[PDB]
Structures are given as structure tokens and as C-alpha cells.
């Protein structure tokens, strides 16, 4: 019969999502004119120096560095954590689906606290891991008592967390972090939307913590999230097997060439990113001001809003699309009830402000 | 003790190959007193539209398409054979673990059939299943008895062969395949090499064989080894379980831009193809006048030769690296007494024969 190993035959259908493009097209204008919110990428792009490296690439016939250690190099420098703690991955997410593959056996327990990123579940279900929900709170806080329950009970082997969280954008605090720590589980912290808050990156935990990895990436800041480059800080007794799983060269020249471009430039991404910070607050204030909308507080680049007064979320969303606006709704049913609006430039803000007028 | 799973603690890792900035740093020569002949990359580099194209990428800050689709469009156009067969990976190389990953659970088996591609062993062991090897003939030709008379007896799910082989570059006998075909088990075909040879793709053959794969790539002819993307052609009833399954995103707008631009320059890849051929036949005759190398008929951009007269292949590759020219040497037991040299400019060949004449 299949040659596909069973647990795969139970995966959800694929979900075909309506490029840009092709709704630009649909509605008869350039790509560049959709204002697009529901993805969390930096309109402003990566620093200058970013296409003029891509645009004068050496050697794109020759396999790219396995150990990409010129980035890693850089990322020491800024990150005061050593190299050999660093690995370089396609995107962040390469680095999620390596630990997932090189902790979790079939049938092997992870800790999810929804709502938060899709990709854990989707990456524990195609490693035929078990996911355990425990739930955020109505504030999107992590339920810390509720979470060492679970872990001394069932024994699972590792637990994602996201800070800025995606969707909602809170931050876990130093004191439940250091709590879930104590647990003899596998914590991953993923600081993706780290650099849009004032909280500092915790890589340099790892060095006192052999249970904690810290995920980050160029992918939304950085404006890389084509390229695919993003990295993370593991403990040594970890990173030495990570290393010799891990597939050779998933890092192309160009992710490697431009991550180390935009870090030649660090007074462009902090200009970039205070203008998104600075565009959060202005857009919270629109957007609390709708009657149908409650937007939760973030630190990320984006602002989650709870869909009120009946109105559907999913037309919502539709409708801004026929107007050329892009925002974010689920089909997760622990989200189906909220809309996601990522930061862009003012222009855009006000662009989807009139057209929500409209509606 | 250890996160990590009981198999992977006694990997054995993957030896890679290292790109012209570490090899600088290694050797201290600049990378244009490199003559690097190790990786069976395209010394011509790509079509001109590539550059063009990656210096004019719009949108670098937003997520590359996850169905390729542009992409797959150019591949129906080239194959022959429908979008909807064809997958794109990051390389070949993420094609060749996404299957093993999406096939084999921890404990089922692969045939391998060596002298071979040295990643199929490296992603098995990954993915904790098991190898069974099934050595080529002395001609590097498959022992397809032995292959018939190995998949019965221990029911492997899965066998990866390459055509042309990695790394002697001989071509598989259709009439073996469709012998292969015939057995209960999943056949993938890497044709990694294939536009080297004067024999057509089997992509085709996929549409009525629902247990063959065939595998391609943008890294060696079409000279897009660093940007990590090739493609697949897959039945229908494995490939609609695989779009569920594969990363969304691991094929950057870089690699997928690349791809596009090269497939529009037909004559640049053929011309390129040609001058590597006709140097493949050159410097096959000059290593055979070699007194220690052996050369074997190649239809690739490679030529393996088994190393005699008392010299160490090991000691043969790193003398060579110290005048600046890098062959590629094996360490596993398989192809410990071979080097295999890739085809280069005829100037690389060049240096080569000019380093081999000091050699003591
Ligand atoms: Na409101
Ligand atoms: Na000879």
C-alpha cells in the first residue's frame, strides 16, 4: 500500500494560502501596492548593504560553509556568547524541527502553551510527537503552577516558549522562566520578536542553564524573512549532537552573506526598529478606538485584536483584502476569534484605518 | 544524562567538503590561487541572469512562496511532465531526507549500493534507520541478483541509487530499473548528474511508476551549488502527503529567483555542459597516462581513479592541497583507495597535471 509511515496519513490537508501577488494581480495593481500586515516582515526592508552583497555574490556555483562560521563569528561579537554555542539554521525554523528531531522519539511528550506559534504543533506532529496544551491565561501569561503540574505528572521531554509571544506579543518574566527551569524538561525560548522590546536577549543563559536553548532570527527585524537565516545560543553538551544531525548546508550563500550585511549596519536595524516600536503605540490607539476591536498590549511588531460586538473575523479579514489590506486570521480554532495587525510604515496604518472606516 | 535520543548519540557526522573562504584561511592562499576541483561545482558559474537577478530581488523581507510555484511552472515546461508531480527542496540533498523522513520509521531499512552518494548513509543513520549494503560490481555496475535476493530476504522499504553513480559516474541499465521497479519497495533515482550524459531523465517514468522518484538539481551543471535548490519528480499519491509534511519555507526567494533566471538562458547551460564534457574526456586521457591513478569511463563532471604504485590517496590529496589544488579524498572503507576529480576549466585541469608532475 503507502510507503508514507502512518502517522503522516493523519496530517491536516495542506492549506494553500493567496500569494500577494496574486491578489495584486486579482485586484489590478503592482505587489508593491498591497499594504502587507499579516506576517510580521519589516517593510522597511534589511539594511543597504543587504542587496548590494546579494547583487555581487562571488561564487554561487560553490557549496556554501557547513559550519557558517563567518556569521556565527559575528553573532559572538554581538551577542558576547561564544561561537561554539551558536548554530545557524534556514530561518529559525530549521532550528526548531532539529531540536524536535534530535530530542523527540515517537510518542515522546512536548509542552505547547496556546495560543502561540503554529509551527510547534505542526513540527511535533510530523515528528510523531505528543503535544500537552497548557493554556495561557486570558492575559496571554503562562500558567506556571499549571505547567510544573503537567511536567511532574506526564514526563515530558521538552516545552516551547515564546517571548514576545506570537500572537499576542506578552513577555514570560525572569522569574517564571528561571521557575520552568528548575523542571527536568527541555525549555526553548524563542526571542523572534526580542529586539522590538527592551528586555534583553537571554543567550547568554545557556551557559548556566544546560536545559535552556534561546532561538532568534533575521527573518522580521533584520527584514531577511526571504533569505531564510536565523540562529540560536545551546548549551555545549547539547550543540555537539545538534552539530553532527544537523544537514550540511540548509544555509545558502546568499542567507549567510546577507545576515552578515545587515549586521555591518547596526545603526539601520535600531533606527528601523524604533520606528516600528514607535508605529505600535500609534496603531494600539487606532485600533482600540474601533467599537468591534480590543487590542491586546505587545512588545513584538504586531498587535493582536480580539474581534467584539459580533462582528466575523474571517469576513473581516476578507473584505481588507479586497481593498488591497492584508491582516492575519486563523483557522486554528483557538484563534478563530481574533485578527492579527503586524506594524508597517504610518502610511500603512493609515491605509488600513480608512479602509476599516469604510467597513 | 541527555536530551538527546539514544541513536543519534552514536552518530557517525557527515564529512562535508569547504568552500573557497575557509579553504583560504587553511591554506593562506587567496581564493583565485585555489584550483578547486573537490565538490563537482561548475567553475563557469551560472547563467549572467542570475546575478542579474539577485542584485534586483524586491522583496528580500518577505517569506519566499512555500509551493515554488513559478518555479514548478518552469519545471513542467522543461521535464515534460505536469506541476503537479514536481517538488522543489533546498538542494536535492532536502529532498533525499524529507523522503526518508516522510517513509521510514526508526528500526525499517534502506538498500545502498556502494562505491555511493555517501549521504544516503549519513541521512539513514539520522533518521535511525538501518543500512543494507549491496556492493557494485568490479565495473561499478549494480548487482541487481544480489539487490532482488536482499530486498526479499530483509524487506528494506526504501533503495537510493544514482545515475550517473556518485562517484565513477557510471549509468544505471534501464532494463535493472524496471527489474528494481518490480519489487515491493520505494526506488529513488538520483539524476543529480544526469545532463553530463547523452541519456534522457526518467522523470517521465514517474507518472506510471508509483514507487520510483527521480531527483534533479540546480548545483552542478547550472551552477547554483550555494544557493540550495533542486527538484523532484514524485507520484501523486506520495507527493500529496509530502506537501503536507515539508517546511514551508527552507527554499529561499533567492534560490527559487535563481533557478527561473537560469532555465531562461537554455543555451548557456548547454554550452556550459559541452565545454565540461569535452574537458572530461581530456583529462580522463591524462590521468590514465598517470602511473598510480587508474581512471574509470565517467558519463558525469567527475572522474574516480583508484590509486596504485604504492601511494596514499590520503597523503596524494593533501600534497595537492599544498600547492592549491583540491581533489577529493575518501575516509570511509568503501572508497578509502580512490581519489575523484572533478572536471574543471581546462586550465584547472592544467594546474592539476602540472602539481601531479612534482609530486615525490
Ligand atoms: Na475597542
Ligand atoms: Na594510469
Same mark, same amino acid.
Given at each position: 500500500?503507502?510507503?508514507?509511515?502512518? #502517522?503522516?496519513?493523519?496530517?491536516?490537508?495542506?492549506?494553500?494560502?493567496?500569494? *500577494?501577488?496574486?491578489?495584486?494581480?486579482?485586484?489590478?495593481?503592482?505587489?508593491?501596492?498591497?499594504? =502587507?500586515?499579516?506576517?510580521?516582515?519589516?517593510? !522597511?526592508?534589511?539594511?543597504?548593504?543587504?542587496?548590494?552583497?546579494?547583487?555581487?555574490?562571488?561564487?554561487? /556555483?560553490?557549496?556554501?560553509?557547513?559550519?557558517?562560521?563567518?556569521?556565527?563569528?559575528?553573532?559572538?561579537?554581538?551577542?558576547?556568547?561564544?561561537?561554539? /554555542?551558536?548554530?545557524?539554521?534556514?530561518?529559525?525554523?530549521?532550528?526548531?524541527?532539529?531540536?524536535?528531531?534530535?530530542?523527540?522519539?515517537?510518542?515522546? =511528550?512536548?509542552?505547547?502553551?496556546?495560543?502561540?506559534?503554529?509551527?510547534?504543533?505542526?513540527?511535533?506532529?510530523?515528528?510523531?510527537?505528543?503535544?500537552?496544551?497548557?493554556?495561557?491565561?486570558?492575559? *496571554?501569561?503562562?500558567? $506556571?503552577?499549571?505547567?510544573?503540574?503537567?511536567?511532574?505528572? @506526564?514526563?515530558?521531554?521538552?516545552?516551547?516558549?515564546?517571548?514576545?509571544?506570537?500572537?499576542?506579543?506578552?513577555?514570560?518574566?525572569?522569574?517564571?522562566?528561571?521557575?520552568?527551569?528548575?523542571?527536568?524538561?527541555?525549555?526553548?525560548?524563542?526571542?523572534? /520578536?526580542?529586539?522590538?522590546?527592551?528586555?534583553?536577549?537571554?543567550?547568554?543563559?545557556?551557559? =548556566?542553564?544546560?536545559?535552556?536553548?534561546?532561538?532568534?532570527? *533575521?527573518?522580521?527585524?533584520?527584514?531577511?524573512?526571504?533569505?531564510? $537565516?536565523?540562529?540560536?545560543?545551546?548549551?555545549?553538551?547539547?550543540? =555537539?549532537?545538534?552539530?553532527?544531525?544537523?544537514?550540511?548546508?540548509?544555509?545558502?550563500?546568499?542567507?549567510?552573506?546577507?545576515?552578515?550585511?545587515?549586521?555591518?549596519?547596526?545603526?539601520?536595524?535600531?533606527?528601523?526598529?524604533?520606528?516600528? $516600536?514607535? @508605529?505600535?503605540?500609534?496603531?494600539?490607539?487606532?485600533?482600540?478606538?474601533?467599537?468591534?476591536?480590543?487590542?491586546?498590549?505587545? #512588545?513584538?511588531? *504586531?498587535?493582536?485584536?480580539?474581534?467584539?460586538?459580533?462582528?466575523?473575523?474571517?469576513?473581516?479579514?476578507?473584505?481588507?483584502?479586497?481593498?488591497?489590506?492584508?491582516?492575519? #486570521? !486563523?483557522?486554528?480554532?483557538?484563534?478563530?476569534? !481574533?485578527?492579527?495587525?503586524? $506594524?508597517?510604515?504610518?502610511? #500603512?496604518?493609515?491605509?488600513?484605518?480608512?479602509?476599516?472606516?469604510?467597513?
Amino acid at each position: 500500500d503507502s510507503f508514507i509511515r502512518q #502517522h503522516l496519513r493523519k496530517l491536516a490537508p495542506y492549506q494553500p494560502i493567496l500569494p *500577494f501577488e496574486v491578489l495584486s494581480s486579482r485586484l489590478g495593481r503592482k505587489p508593491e501596492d498591497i499594504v =502587507k500586515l499579516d506576517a510580521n516582515e519589516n517593510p !522597511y526592508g534589511p539594511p543597504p548593504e543587504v542587496m548590494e552583497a546579494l547583487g555581487s555574490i562571488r561564487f554561487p /556555483y560553490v557549496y556554501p560553509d557547513p559550519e557558517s562560521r563567518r556569521l556565527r563569528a559575528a553573532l559572538a561579537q554581538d551577542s558576547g556568547l561564544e561561537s561554539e /554555542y551558536i548554530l545557524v539554521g534556514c530561518g529559525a525554523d530549521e532550528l526548531i524541527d532539529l531540536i524536535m528531531r534530535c530530542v523527540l522519539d515517537p510518542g515522546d =511528550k512536548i509542552v505547547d502553551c496556546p495560543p502561540t506559534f503554529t509551527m510547534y504543533e505542526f513540527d511535533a506532529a510530523v515528528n510523531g510527537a505528543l503535544v500537552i496544551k497548557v493554556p495561557r491565561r486570558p492575559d *496571554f501569561s503562562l500558567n $506556571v503552577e499549571q505547567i510544573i503540574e503537567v511536567v511532574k505528572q @506526564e514526563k515530558p521531554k521538552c516545552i516551547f516558549l515564546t517571548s514576545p509571544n506570537n500572537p499576542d506579543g506578552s513577555i514570560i518574566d525572569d522569574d517564571d522562566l528561571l521557575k520552568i527551569l528548575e523542571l527536568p524538561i527541555l525549555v526553548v525560548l524563542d526571542e523572534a /520578536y526580542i529586539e522590538f522590546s527592551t528586555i534583553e536577549s537571554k543567550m547568554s543563559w545557556v551557559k =548556566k542553564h544546560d536545559n535552556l536553548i534561546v532561538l532568534r532570527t *533575521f527573518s522580521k527585524r533584520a527584514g531577511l524573512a526571504g533569505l531564510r $537565516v536565523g540562529y540560536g545560543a545551546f548549551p555545549l553538551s547539547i550543540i =555537539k549532537y545538534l552539530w553532527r544531525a544537523k544537514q550540511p548546508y540548509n544555509v545558502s550563500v546568499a542567507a549567510e552573506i546577507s545576515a552578515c550585511a545587515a549586521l555591518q549596519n547596526p545603526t539601520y536595524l535600531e533606527n528601523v526598529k524604533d520606528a516600528l $516600536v514607535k @508605529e505600535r503605540g500609534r496603531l494600539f490607539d487606532l485600533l482600540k478606538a474601533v467599537p468591534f476591536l480590543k487590542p491586546f498590549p505587545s #512588545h513584538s511588531n *504586531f498587535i493582536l485584536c480580539e474581534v467584539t460586538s459580533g462582528v466575523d473575523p474571517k469576513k473581516l479579514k476578507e473584505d481588507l483584502a479586497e481593498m488591497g489590506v492584508m491582516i492575519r #486570521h !486563523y483557522s486554528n480554532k483557538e484563534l478563530k476569534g !481574533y485578527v492579527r495587525v503586524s $506594524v508597517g510604515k504610518p502610511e #500603512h496604518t493609515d491605509v488600513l484605518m480608512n479602509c476599516i472606516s469604510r467597513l
